[PDB]
Amino acid sequence: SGAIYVGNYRVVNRHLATHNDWANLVWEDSSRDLLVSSTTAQGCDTIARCDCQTGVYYCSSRRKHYPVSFSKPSLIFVEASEYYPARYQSHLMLAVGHSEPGDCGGILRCQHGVVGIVSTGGNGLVGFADVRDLLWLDEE
């Protein structure tokens, strides 16, 4: 589990969104595994606006932050899980690292701010849903 809290937005994995998230929906995209809902309180996270390919992510199943090198956001084939059939997920970045179902939501960050959240795992790989192209998170 985990979310990004920027401005009056909460960014979560679409497959982990709660009823309150769907009842206060701003935007969702199944192909990216992302959903954004509105919040009453302002958040403290800042979004990175860069092309970094190195950063650090939080792994809840290890209670640890790991430094990683990650690929550029791309369209990647992801195997079937309890939440999605086997399909292509867009705006996904891959790295070598540990990721279980429960690690989704952990933040990946670079020197500029939050880059994305854990969305996929297994086989010694971790995949992150990028948010750096969502410029509207910084306004309204």
Ligand X SMILES: C[C@]1(C(=O)N2CCC[C@H](C(N)=O)C2)CCCCO1
Active site residues: 15, 33, 104
- Does the protein bind ligand X through residue 43 (CB under 6 A)? no
Residue for token pair 């952990």: 106
Alpha-carbon gap, residue 65 to 85, rounded angstroms: 29
Residue 30: strand, helix, or coil: helix
- Does the protein bind ligand X through residue 99 (CB under 6 A)? yes
Q: Could you tell me the smallest distance in angstroms from the CB atom of residue 1 to Zn ion?
A: 24
Instruction: Tell me which of ligand X, Zn ion, none is bound by residue 48, counting a contact when its beta carbon lies within the kind-specific cut-off of 5 to 8 angstroms.
Output: Zn ion
Judge whether 112 is annotated as a binding position: yes
Nearest to 66 by CA among 134, 12, 112, 124: 124
Cβ(105)–Cβ(48) under 8 Å? no
Q: Could you tell me the smallest distance in angstroms from the CB atom of residue 1 to ligand X?
A: 11
Residue 51: strand, helix, or coil: coil
Which of residues 10, 113, 119, 134 is near ligand X by CB under 6 A? Answer: 119
Contact string 50-89 vs ligand X (x = CB under 6 A): ----------------------------x--x-xx----x
Alpha-carbon gap, residue 14 to 11, rounded angstroms: 9
Residue for token pair 């996929």: 120
Judge whether 19 is annotated as a binding position: no
Binding site for ligand X (CB under 6 A): 15, 33, 78, 81, 83-84, 89, 99-101, 103-104, 119-122
